[PDB]
Amino acid sequence: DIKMTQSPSSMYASLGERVTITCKASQDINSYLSWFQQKPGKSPKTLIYRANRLVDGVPSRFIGTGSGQDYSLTISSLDYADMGIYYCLQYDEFPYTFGGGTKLEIKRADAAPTVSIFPPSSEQLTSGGASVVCFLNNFYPKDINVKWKIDGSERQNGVLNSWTDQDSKDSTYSMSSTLTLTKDEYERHNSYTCEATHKTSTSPIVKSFNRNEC
Amino acid sequence: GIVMSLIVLAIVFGNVLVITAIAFERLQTVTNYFITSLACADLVMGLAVVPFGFWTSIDVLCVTASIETLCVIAVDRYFAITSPFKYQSLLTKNKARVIILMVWIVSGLTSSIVSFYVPLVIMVFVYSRVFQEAKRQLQKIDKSEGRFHVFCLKEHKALKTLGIIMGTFTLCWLPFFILNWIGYVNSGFNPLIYCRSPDFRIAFQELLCLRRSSLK
Amino acid sequence: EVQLQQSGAELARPGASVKLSCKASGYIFTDYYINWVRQRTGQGFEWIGEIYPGSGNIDYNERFKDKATLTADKSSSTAYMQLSSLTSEDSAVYFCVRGFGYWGQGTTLTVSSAKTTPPSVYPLAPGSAAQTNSAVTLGCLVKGYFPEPVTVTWNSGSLSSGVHTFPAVLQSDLYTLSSSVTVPSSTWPSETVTCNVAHPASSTKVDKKIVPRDCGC
Incomplete structure (x- = not known):
């Protein structure tokens, strides 16, 4: 036209x-x-x-x-x-x-993320499954990276990722990575880590949690 | 026959709801002064011609004043547009009547070339010119007008209403001047196209103690 | 106070037909045409046509010529768009503008054989009482719903500075999303903190308070 x-x-x-x-x-x-x-x-x-x-x-x-x-x-x-x-x-x-x-x-300005991981809320667990959320937050450059680790092992199967557009105030980038599992799936492992590697540093920022004491 | 009898009350109602509609303040204008003319040339030709059908005298003075008035407006409306100022012909209120009065006696002192051809030969081009040069303007307008704001498309439809009234009286009385019942048909066609086209809609449909969509 | 109200969420089976509306209220309806632009997911805009409420002129764009049919309501001061034989590719956000000046809210039309199913707000609180900050970041993952979209505020709109919400990613024919939030550690467990959720497609609003934790974790 x-x-x-x-x-x-x-x-x-x-x-x-x-x-x-x-x-x-x-x-x-x-x-x-x-x-x-x-x-x-x-x-x-x-x-x-x-x-x-x-x-x-x-x-x-x-x-x-x-x-x-x-x-x-x-x-x-x-x-x-x-x-x-x-x-x-x-x-x-x-x-x-x-x-x-x-x-x-x-x-x-280059700013590393402030990561945090949460285990499945009893509420969902009872319902039938379990989703683990990890929040890689407020980071710039936009290019960021995550990799789930479980019991030392490590995999990227069934993870639901999503990043946000430039934030208003902080004008930084934040990402959300979720690895969806089952009550069972989840019950079969103890250690759960979320490692994020961002230009900011060379040492992956990391967060973990065990399924027992918790 | 006794079934078409309902076609007379139509030429005695729709032409009266109009005459009264004109005889409201806002509905008083040169355009609706000649359209209100074709009301007496449909009501009189229905309560004096249709009933008994001197009877062939008013049968001509009626249909020879129509395509004559149709010739009038086509020119009036033109003089309105070709005009350097606002849209509304210069034919004063009184000189509209003085001009209207002379459309009847000359329609009485009166042929298919005098009372039909002549009045339609030019009437179709004086209007053609109009419907056309009314387009160049229609959008020589500022596009922005209407979508950013902070003659128009409306008066472009008022020539649509007057554009079919002149476009129906042609396909109704042409096969006859070239079927005498088809000509009578344009008696319940004007106050019919004035509903879903011009302001008349409310002007007369709600005059009957609020018709329907009166926030029913 | 100027605005064209729109549905925001509209589900339709393939082959059917929706009829989006747009209730303008804040100006004189018949003083502006109002177009209907379609903007698919991802990006891009494609004008569907323009109708002039005042007159009646409705200039359709060839493409939607027979697909859509505009119409206005002088009284109600709302206008409509007839979308016939909707197909999978007819799904997108349909905007109702005021001639490209002021845009509407938007209607997340979605043609699908799918059945609706409301979300499942689950709250995410800090793991092992790790008081490792001047602040704290909790969040509430809304899992599995449809169709799009879903409003997700925090503290009944109250909280704002520091709350992120991520775009609903699909996952096994069902949407899933989540919103995290930072506040002063000096506040949350002390003062209440809820997370709101809204699924119009289902006319489903929801609140989920964030009780600290199992005290054990």
């Missing part, structure tokens, strides 16, 4: 600097373009339309400026709260076509 590329895609800016994404459509939309932001777990908040006409409420540090066939959303003095995925939209003609959005992350 009307392809609208959008460089960049990925992009890491630090606090204070002026980041910038540039949008370029196929045709010629008469400044009939708009810029909005998608934040994980929220509905899109629009910032600019008519290529540059800021929406009411948007902070004055956002600037849209292009014309004819290429534009660009821009912010001077990037604020911490400015992490997410901005997309450019054209409504010059049908069908309204969206950009593909460039996602912007904020470079923070």
Whole structure:
């Protein structure tokens, strides 16, 4: 219909600097373009339309400026709260076509995770099974790593992992790894460790627990 | 026959609920002054022509004033759009009547080329021009208008309502001027298309002590 | 106070048909068209069409031309979208905007042969009384539910600074997720700390207090 590329895609800016994404459509939309932001777990908040006409409420540090066939959303003095995925939209003609959005992350300071493991709550155990949760928390760089160890042994079978997008305040990354088991499965072993290896250090951060005294 | 008898009360009701509807403040305008004209050219041709069917005198003064009035609006509405200012022809309220009065006597002093061709030959193009140049504007509008806000698409439908009233009176009285019962059909078609198209909907449907959707 | 209310959770069997709504209330309905954009999981936006409540003009996008059918309600000041013969690929988040200005809440429509089943909030408290911090991090894993999504707050929305919730990962045709929380060790066992959970798909709200531990562990 009307392809609208959008460089960049990925992009890491630090606090204070002026980041910038540039949008370029196929045709010629008469400044009939708009810029909005998608934040994980929220509905899109629009910032600019008519290529540059800021929406009411948007902070004055956002600037849209292009014309004819290429534009660009821009912010001077990037604020911490400015992490997410901005997309450019054209409504010059049908069908309204969206950009593909460039996602912007904020470079923070290296910070190791604060890990913690929890054994199965009696409550579930009674129900019929047992899930062990370990929380690798607030760490930057985003790249992190976990490996479950059991009775000295070690395996990665049936583990449910999930990481979060950049946190708001701490602008850090936290991960959750769960190894789902059965009352039985779980009852067959005593030692349970969660080792996380993150650039922060070379020595895996570790946490363990036994199924007996407990 | 005795079954179509219900087709007269239709040409004595829908054309009266309209005459009264016009005779409310907001419903008083040049457009609804000529549309209210085709009411007396449907009610009179139903309580004076349909019953007995001088009877062939008012049969012409009625159908020769219709496609004539249809020629009027098509031009009026045009002069309204081609106009440099707001949408609503300049035909003053009184000169609308003075102009309306002269549509009857000339309809009485009156042929398929005089009272049919001529009035439809131009009426279809004076309007064609309109329905067309009403499009260029329709969106020469600011796209943003309506999606960011903080003649339009509405008055674009008012020409839809007047665009079928002129588009039904053609397929009803053409096979005849080229079936005399089909022409009578456009007597219960105008106050019928005015429900699901123009404001009339509420204007007259709720006038009968709140019809149905009156927050029923 | 401006807003287009939306269902948030909608389950539908393959081949069926849902009819999402969007109750706008905070402006004059007929002064803005409202489009219906679809945004599948992962990412990407695809406009489904735009309808102008005031008039009636409904410009569909070819693709959804015969698939969806927009409609507005001048009175109720709510608008709808008829999605016929829903298929596995019709599952995604359907947004109701005000012409790309203000977006709606969103409706997590999901076409599936699956049967619904509410979560199972289980609380995760510290293992062996390890008083190893100025703070503490407890959490509550909501396991096995469907379909998506599930609101998960802490302390009835009360607590905020320091609470993470991870994206429901699927696992054996059933969603599972969890939310951890840090607070001052100087507080929790002392003052109450609950974890809330909500599954609209099932209209199921839930609270789970965090009793310290078995005193033994």
